[PDB]
């Protein structure tokens, strides 16, 4: 009930000191589907309170980790000490096709590897030496990007000049990116720093080139990172509907695809938070319109295929119907097999920006109810979009601390919890089935129709696995 959820939020906040408690209450809200504006309900994207165990990453993770890293052709140098590159290597499954170390470099870790000499003297000379070295060793790379670690902003290193000078020397595009971890308050500013970086150094290269032939049906998937091959499953559906996909941002992406993006007629934006900055820019500079779409679950996909097709002519609209017709028996077969298995089961979700709101339809497509949801670093426009999707009196949390999350879960008692890797081991111990939302627990893809069968199957094996019955010892 609303009074009960409100009491639960108040009850939990009692443990925190006053500055932290006062700030946190602004981040916890009982959801009202009716409210138009998020700010009345919840406040978000504010610096995290220290010592409370926030799940948030840094700006480097948002820029190097999510937008830039997935491009296959280019090489990304983590600039600074050895650790950031190391922890983040091959961490995220932005799937790609290529010959690694020869033409594609995604799983590879490239670093300046700062030592103290570099911190005292500075890293520019080294970055230039590293750029020259990168070039002799890996001759087929199509670009280079420098992702700034925290020490770069602090020691006064100018990477723009090195990037500009070397790029000119090598006739190669080098993108300096200032995603220092201290900048911003979450993985979020890094998306913006990364998006802006893409726009200043790589978007306008084929500004005057008219050689590529473009059909009126050309479209670019923006903000789909192909985790587990999500983009590929999403991509085949758009192609079957008759649209041509020129570019993917940035999963399994190539710099050539990105440079060819402005040529496209429409931009389909899957992840609003990460790449909306670039989408708005493209609409202002090139006039290309952008529409948010959802491919999780058969209902959102059908609704999404239908909306995208309307923006096009009747042949496309007709093709859209054939495809929905084609995969209808496949998806309903999945629903028939797994809905009886997952029906009425309550779900709690914590993820960073796009997914807490987005996977709701799929869960509901399986008869699961999402009791509560939250975001690691989402803005209020994200929250505006969220409440309509969330049911009434359901719990909403922004930048939930670890302590708050355990307490909410103990009270609420959800059947299944979808969250990241740090959160997962605590819950399994608690006996609550856990599915990792970020990595799709090494499964996927979860996008599209093909993705939905994997998703239903995954929720069902984890939720109903025999291991949950076995936790209390028989001898009391």
């Amino acid at each position: 009930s609303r009074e009960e959820v409100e009491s639960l939020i108040q009850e939990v906040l009692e443990v925190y000191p006053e500055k932290a408690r006062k700030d946190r209450n602004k981040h916890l809200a009982v959801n009202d589907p009716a409210v138009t504006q998020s700010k009345k309900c919840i406040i978000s994207n504010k610096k995290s309170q220290p010592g409370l165990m926030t799940i948030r990453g840094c700006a480097y993770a948002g820029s190097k980790g999510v937008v830039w890293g997935p491009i296959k052709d280019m090489i990304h140098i983590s600039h600074g000490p050895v650790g950031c590159g190391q922890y983040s290597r091959a961490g995220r499954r932005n799937y790609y096709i290529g010959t690694t170390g020869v033409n594609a470099f995604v799983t590879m870790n490239f670093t300046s590897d700062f030592q103290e000499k570099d911190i005292v003297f500075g890293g520019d000379k080294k970055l230039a030496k590293l750029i020259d070295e990168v070039e002799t060793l890996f001759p087929l790379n199509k670009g280079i990007s420098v992702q700034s670690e925290c020490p770069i902003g602090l020691i006064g290193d100018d990477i723009e000049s090195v990037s500009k000078v070397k790029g000119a020397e090598l006739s190669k595009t080098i993108v300096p990116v200032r995603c220092e971890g201290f900048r911003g308050v979450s993985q979020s500013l890094g998306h913006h720093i990364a998006n802006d970086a893409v726009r200043d150094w790589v978007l306008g290269k084929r500004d005057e080139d008219t050689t590529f032939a473009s059909t009126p049906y050309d479209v670019a998937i923006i903000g789909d990172y192909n985790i587990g091959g999500d983009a590929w499953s999403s991509r085949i559906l758009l192609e079957e509907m008759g649209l041509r996909c020129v570019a993917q941002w940035s999963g399994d992406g190539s710099i050539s695809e990105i440079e060819l993006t402005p040529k496209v007629k429409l931009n389909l934006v899957h992840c609003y938070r990460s790449m909306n900055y670039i989408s708005r820019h493209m609409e202002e500079k090139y006039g290309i319109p952008w529409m948010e779409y959802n491919f999780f679950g058969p209902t959102k996909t059908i609704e999404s295929l239908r909306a995208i097709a309307a923006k096009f002519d009747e042949s496309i609209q007709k093709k859209c119907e054939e495809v929905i017709a084609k995969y209808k028996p496949e998806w309903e077969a999945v629903v028939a097999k797994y809905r009886p298995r997952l029906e009425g089961k309550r779900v709690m979700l914590y993820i960073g920006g796009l997914r807490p709101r987005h996977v709701i339809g799929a869960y509901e497509d399986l008869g699961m109810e999402v009791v509560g949801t939250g975001y690691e670093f989402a803005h209020n426009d994200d929250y505006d979009r969220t409440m309509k999707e969330m049911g009434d009196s359901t719990l909403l949390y922004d930048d939930v601390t670890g302590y708050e999350f355990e307490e909410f879960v103990k009270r609420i008692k959800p059947d299944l919890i979808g969250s990241g890797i740090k959160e997962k081991f605590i819950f399994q111990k608690m006996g609550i089935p856990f599915r990792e939302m970020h990595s799709w627990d090494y499964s996927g893809p979860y996008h599209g129709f093909d993705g939905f069968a994997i998703f239903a199957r995954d929720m069902d094996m984890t939720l109903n696995n025999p291991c949950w019955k076995k936790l209390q010892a028989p001898w009391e």
Binding site: V15, A20, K47, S48, P50, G51, I55, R56, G57, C58, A59, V82, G83, G85, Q86, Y87, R89, Y95, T99, T100, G101, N103, F110, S112, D113, Q115, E116, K126, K129, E133, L137, L140, C150, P151, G153, E180, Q187, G229, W232, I236, C245, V246, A247, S254, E257, E330, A333, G402, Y403, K422, F425, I426, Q428, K429, M430, D450, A453, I454, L471, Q472
Partner: protein
């Protein structure tokens, strides 16, 4: 399309013809990919000797490092103490990364907190975050002790940890009496091992420095054991078991084993076990302090020898037959307790396993990498097994250590083709396995990719990866293994002989081609 009866995951779903056609169209249409012949020409080029020279010529670019930063080392050590919460002063993204790197390797929850310093915190300093952070963390997680380490942003701006922590107490944010050991841990200097060494000397120094007069050496009749940075539970367990078997009293400083291994019984335990504060305070009263991994325990050796006046014995990490014998004899001399019949039987068994598996193991060529103590221990053991370690690489190693290892290799007729490399990454190693080929590679999960590259050149050129080391992310529960002691030696011996036999079987499994050698009994 998906048959509901047998659903396909990414693999082999993308192997379907509709998807294959789509990807090719995508590649041909928008990727502007280099021709396959060019990609092939370039790939064959990297496998060569000529490329290895340009690759080994690098002075500024590191590709695929075999080392991690200091705070990782600091957080793990802080985890060793009872009801202790690791706390890292500096930016938050580092903490998320440490928890995740640890979570994946241990498949267990890892508790860590940050004071969350921002851009604004960069100009002013880390003072507010430290007071609020210490106050918030204590109120929320109830840790008995909070151990501070720092992220590079903090190190570069220069926040004073000691001054910040004292002012926090002075201003009243946290009690005066609440333990708050702190260690500066610059990511640019060293590795996670050095990070581990700093956190430990700091914890040891905080508890024992002010009071030393009351302390008298050998008064408590226990031997302090300092594990160092360790990611195998079996190792903490084995050291304790043998000392226990021997009857020797001991104090394991920084024992993270209970917490990294708590049971799923329906209740989440943030804190489990750990080294007690009193154990740490009463430490100088031990007869002696033994350091398990001496190479990264240098700062702690200086504090223990100088302040506690313990004469730390020079002993190599207890790996292999000889080093284990040495560790036990030494404990026997310090404890005054004899080596029991039970332990001598175990050594007997290790030798019996060695005599039993010697023909398959003999002459095998290995390329291996890791932290310096572990690598050093493994190299010693392989030589004891008569195997040939061709390429030895320690990224975070040094000149003294390299000198120590060459000495070990010189002592054995086996270490003839062996070469030690330091400061060289996995990219360097990839080149080495291609130019001079080892039978096998012993290392962490990062080598899965080197193996992939070799198989690409050809079947015959592939070097299978054998996983011993840290981090291991593609296999489950290997962190429950033991590398120390006789038991550790037995586990390592079984994995190596079986890795070798497993490979022979794969090679002789072809029907009427190589199956003549696909023997039932080996």
């Amino acid at each position: 399309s998906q048959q509901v009866d047998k659903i396909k995951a990414s693999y082999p779903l993308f192997l379907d013809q509709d998807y294959k056609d789509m990807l090719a169209k995508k590649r041909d249409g928008f990727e502007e990919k280099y021709p396959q012949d060019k990609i092939d020409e370039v790939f064959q080029w990297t496998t060569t000797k000529e490329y290895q020279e340009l690759n080994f010529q690098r002075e500024a670019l590191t590709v695929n490092p075999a080392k991690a930063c200091q705070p990782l080392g600091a957080v793990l050590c802080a985890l060793g103490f009872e009801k202790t919460m690791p706390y890292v002063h500096g930016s938050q993204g580092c903490v998320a990364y440490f928890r995740s790197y640890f979570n994946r390797h241990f498949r267990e929850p890892v508790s860590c907190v940050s004071d969350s310093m921002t851009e604004d915190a960069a100009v002013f300093g880390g003072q507010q975050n430290m007071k609020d952070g210490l106050q918030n963390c204590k109120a929320t997680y109830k840790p008995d002790m909070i151990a501070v380490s720092t992220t590079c942003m903090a190190e570069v701006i220069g926040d004073d940890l000691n001054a910040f922590i004292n002012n926090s107490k002075k201003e009243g944010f946290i009690p005066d009496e609440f333990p708050v050991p702190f260690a500066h841990t610059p990511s640019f200097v060293g590795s996670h091992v050095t990070g581990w060494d700093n956190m430990f000397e700091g914890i040891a120094r905080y508890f024992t420095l002010k009071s030393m007069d009351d302390k008298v050496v050998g008064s408590n009749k226990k031997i302090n054991i300092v594990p160092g940075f360790e990611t195998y539970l079996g190792n903490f367990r084995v050291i304790k078991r043998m000392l226990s078997e021997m009857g020797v009293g001991y104090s394991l400083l920084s024992d993270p084993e209970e917490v990294l291994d708590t049971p799923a019984d329906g209740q989440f335990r943030m804190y489990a076990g750990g080294t007690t504060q009193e154990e740490m305070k009463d430490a100088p009263n031990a007869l002696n302090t033994v350091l398990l991994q001496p190479w990264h325990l240098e700062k702690t050796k200086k504090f223990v020898e100088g302040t506690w006046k313990h004469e730390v014995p020079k002993l190599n990490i207890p790996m292999g037959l000889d080093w284990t014998d040495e560790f036990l004899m030494k404990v026997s001399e310090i404890s005054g307790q004899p080596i029991p019949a039970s332990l001598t039987k175990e050594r007997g068994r290790l030798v019996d396993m060695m005599t039993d598996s010697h023909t398959w193991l003999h002459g095998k060529r290995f390329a291996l990498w890791g932290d310096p103590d572990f690598v050093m221990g493994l190299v010693k053991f392989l030589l004891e097994l008569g195997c040939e370690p061709v390429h030895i690489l320690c990224h975070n190693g040094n000149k003294r250590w390299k000198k120590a290892v060459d000495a070990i290799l010189a002592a054995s007729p086996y270490g003839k083709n062996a070469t030690v490399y330091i400061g060289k990454d996995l990219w360097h190693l990839r080149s080495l396995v291609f130019t001079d080929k080892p039978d096998f590679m012993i290392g962490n999960s990062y080598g899965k990719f080197i193996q992939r590259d070799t198989l690409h050149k050809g079947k015959e050129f592939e070097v299978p990866l054998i996983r011993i080391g840290f981090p291991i992310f593609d296999r489950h529960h290997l962190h429950r293994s033991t590398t120390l002691g006789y038991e550790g030696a037995m586990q390592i011996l079984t994995t190596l002989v079986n890795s070798i036999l497993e490979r022979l079987d794969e090679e002789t499994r072809g029907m009427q081609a190589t199956d003549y050698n696909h023997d039932l009994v080996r």
